[PDB]
């Protein structure tokens, strides 16, 4: 009964890896913005 395989309520991965940031542009500014949405 308790050994029957079941699908959990929250399926899939429960964590996400951070994506490394974009390469900064060689313009002489410290402020670098990611691709805006």
């Amino acid at each position: 009964c308790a050994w029957i395989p079941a699908k959990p309520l929250v399926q899939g991965a429960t964590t996400a890896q951070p994506i490394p940031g974009p390469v900064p542009v060689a313009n002489g500014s410290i402020f670098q913005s990611a691709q805006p949405i």
């Binding site: 060689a26 313009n27 002489g28 500014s29 410290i30 670098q32």
Partner: protein, 303 residues
């Protein structure tokens, strides 16, 4: 020596650096440290870094230490070892920073990276501001920014003020001085200049371009009004149209309606407006009403 005063070079820009520090050596005019817990917290952090561990439960009431924020400008083409000026501003309930000293302060950029280290003695005027000071050569540059200068054959001169006429004048001056297709105009603010490939050649080209003389064409008529400081400034292009003006406690030097003549140059405008006998605060309302009516042939900007 006018092009260097009218434009800026693309990629040659300044950045802003910020940081937190402690200022010591005050004559009892520092933080109260009872309403500013971060002062004592960061002093304990510094002492722990230096090897002294003050027990967590202890009352520390200082008088010669103030928590301050340090601001600096990262110059173009900054190199490590170079020194820059910094501004030191108190953050909470401090009374003065007259003879203080700024301890080791890392100056972070927008990307939260250390680009300079600040440490020095504050100079405070002493009617004068007591909670703000400046340290000349107070910060040493520690990081360098990559740049694309010297790469490619195109560099953009960016005008401080947008003007198609001024852009065309700068383009024509560069073409008159350094060949046919040396400079082209992209918009009212940007002039594209062709330069030889390399670093030294582009420095030579920019050195010749920067000190060039360009005759400034007449700008747009503009009247700047500052109500917070109570000032009015009119440039040389302001003209007037004939119309009648009335305002409280102002009369002909007689009736309350005073004629204002049609004026072509700035001297005529000044004479016509001084004939009104108006205080500058009254002149602000008069000018706004005349702009609404249409006598003032200028752009009225309130700053």
């Amino acid at each position: 020596e006018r092009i260097r005063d009218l434009t800026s070079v693309q990629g040659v820009r300044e950045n802003s650096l910020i940081g937190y520090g402690l200022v010591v050596g005050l004559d009892g005019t520092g933080d109260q440290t009872t309403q500013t817990p971060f002062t004592t917290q960061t002093l304990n952090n510094m002492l722990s870094q230096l090897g002294i561990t003050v027990p967590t439960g202890t009352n520390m009431q200082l008088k010669n230490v103030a928590a301050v924020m340090v601001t600096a400008s990262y110059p173009p083409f900054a190199r490590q070892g170079q020194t820059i000026d910094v501004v030191v501003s108190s953050m909470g309930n401090a009374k003065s920073l007259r003879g203080g000293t700024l301890l080791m302060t890392p100056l972070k950029g927008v990307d939260s990276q250390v680009y300079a280290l600040a440490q020095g003695n504050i100079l405070v005027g002493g009617v004068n501001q007591l909670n703000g000071g400046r340290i000349t050569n107070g910060a040493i540059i520690e990081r360098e920014l990559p740049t694309q200068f010297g790469a490619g054959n195109t560099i953009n001169l960016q005008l401080n003020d947008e003007d198609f006429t001024m852009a065309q004048q700068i383009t024509d001056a560069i073409n008159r001085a350094r060949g046919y297709g040396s400079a082209t105009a992209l918009d009212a603010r940007t002039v594209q200049v062709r330069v030889p490939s390399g670093n030294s050649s582009q420095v030579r080209f920019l050195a010749d371009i920067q000190n060039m003389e360009v005759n400034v064409t007449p700008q747009d008529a503009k009247v700047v009004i500052n109500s917070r400081t109570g000032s009015v400034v009119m440039n040389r292009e302001v003209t007037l149209d004939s119309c009648a003006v009335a305002q409280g406690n102002l009369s002909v030097t007689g009736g309350s309606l005073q004629s204002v003549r049609s004026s072509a140059n700035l001297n005529s405008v000044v004479r016509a407006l001084n004939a009104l006998g108006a205080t500058p605060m009254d002149l602000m309302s008069i000018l706004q009403s005349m702009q609404s009516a249409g006598c003032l042939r200028a752009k009225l900007e309130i700053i």
